[PDB]
Amino acid sequence: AQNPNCNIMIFHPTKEEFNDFDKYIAYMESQGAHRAGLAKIIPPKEWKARETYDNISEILIATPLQQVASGRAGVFTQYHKKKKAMTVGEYRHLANSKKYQTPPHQNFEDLERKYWKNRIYNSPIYGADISGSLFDENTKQWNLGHLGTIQDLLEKECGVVIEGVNTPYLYFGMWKTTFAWHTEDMDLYSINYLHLGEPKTWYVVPPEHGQRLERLARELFPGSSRGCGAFLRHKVALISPTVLKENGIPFNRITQEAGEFMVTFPYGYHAGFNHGFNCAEAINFATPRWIDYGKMASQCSCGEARVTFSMDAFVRILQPERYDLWKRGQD
Ligand SMILES: O=C(O)CNC(=O)C(=O)O
Numbered sequence: 001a002q003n004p005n006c007n008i009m010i011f012h013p014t015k016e017e018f019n020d021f022d023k024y025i026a027y028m029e030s031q032g033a034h035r036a037g038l039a040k041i042i043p044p045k046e047w048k049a050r051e052t053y054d055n056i057s058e059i060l061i062a063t064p065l066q067q068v069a070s071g072r073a074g075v076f077t078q079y080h081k082k083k084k085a086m087t088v089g090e091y092r093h094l095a096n097s098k099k100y101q102t103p104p105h106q107n108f109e110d111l112e113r114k115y116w117k118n119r120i121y122n123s124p125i126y127g128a129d130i131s132g133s134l135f136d137e138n139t140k141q142w143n144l145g146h147l148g149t150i151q152d153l154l155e156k157e158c159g160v161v162i163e164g165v166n167t168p169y170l171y172f173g174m175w176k177t178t179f180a181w182h183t184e185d186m187d188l189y190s191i192n193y194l195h196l197g198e199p200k201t202w203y204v205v206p207p208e209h210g211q212r213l214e215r216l217a218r219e220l221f222p223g224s225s226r227g228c229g230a231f232l233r234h235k236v237a238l239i240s241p242t243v244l245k246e247n248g249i250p251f252n253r254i255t256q257e258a259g260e261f262m263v264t265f266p267y268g269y270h271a272g273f274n275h276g277f278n279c280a281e282a283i284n285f286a287t288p289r290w291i292d293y294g295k296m297a298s299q300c301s302c303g304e305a306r307v308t309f310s311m312d313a314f315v316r317i318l319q320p321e322r323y324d325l326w327k328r329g330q331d
């Protein structure tokens with residue numbers, strides 16, 4: 001078995017190897033990459049997402065989210081308070097303000113310490129889940145706006161044609177902005193490209209050990225657990241590495257820098273934070289290996305997680321028994 005310790009793998013494809021996305025994903029899995037839940041892909045040196053970032057300041061963040069924390073430093077929840085719209089230029093200036101900027105630090109490890117010690121005492125503002133793309137239309141390789149669609153994968157594998165579309169999303173982050181412990185909708189893959197700015201630190205639990213993280217989460221967030229049988233789908237709970245280590249939960253960590261791709265694998269729980277002002281683009285995708293994960297994916301039926309038009313069809317086709325109760329939560 002390849003990669004039996006489930007370490008995060010880092011790949012350096014040549015420009016030749018960067019032509020066929022599906023094939024490269026299948027290569028990484030041949031080497032065991034999915035066992036970690038997360039992989040880093042460093043693009044060929046010749047490749048670029050676009051020529052410059054010089055004209056992005058007029059993108060609108062219609063609903064910036066202020067991430068307010070409750071709990072203790074290593075075990076907390078966050079709620080998103082909606083703020084007034086602002087442009088990317090306005091947001092960048094805010095991120096660079098004395099109130100919100102990254103503190104002085106020695107290296108990524110010191111910064112990680114400061115994040116876990118101090119996150120809960122601040123409320124950074126995240127420009128998340130903005131439909132759009134920063135890839136130039138002429139970028140042919142690993143263009144997250146030109147990927148094969150999940151609906152087309154389901155059609156190719158299963159023969160059934162369904163409605164729905166699959167488009168990317170932009171994330172504008174600042175120091176301390178946080179992504180809570182989650183897997184993707186329908187336990188899909190995700191791919192995330194860090195277009196610009198400061199790094200993003202990731203934590204991940206191997207898919208084979210996801211239920212260990214779920215059991216810990218039920219113990220640490222016991223009211224949330226009683227409220228919903230899949231409450232990590234709400235994307236609100238944080239657990240620190242120290243706490244995970246105290247409870248024997250297998251995980252790994254890695255820092256993504258600008259210009260790098262990360263891939264999350266089906267049922268790979270992940271969480272993390274941004275080091276400073278940055279812009280990431282991400283999208284879900286599927287492969288044939290995903291289908292079985294999609295059929296087994298948990299679902300939020302309490303009604304909090306409230307998810308896309310396109311997830312309807314996935315549930316309807318892969319999870320027909322759940323169908324019914326799940327759409328009661330989404331209507
Ligand atoms: O970048 C973020 O805030 C969150 N991204 C992801 O969870 C992802 O790409 O799957």
Ligand SMILES: [Mg+2]
Pocket residue numbers: 055056057058059
């Ligand atoms: Mg602009």
Ligand code: NI
Pocket residue numbers: 182183184190264270
């Ligand atoms: Ni994710």
Ligand SMILES: [Zn+2]
Pocket residue numbers: 227228229230231233234300301302303304305
């Ligand atoms: Zn729920």
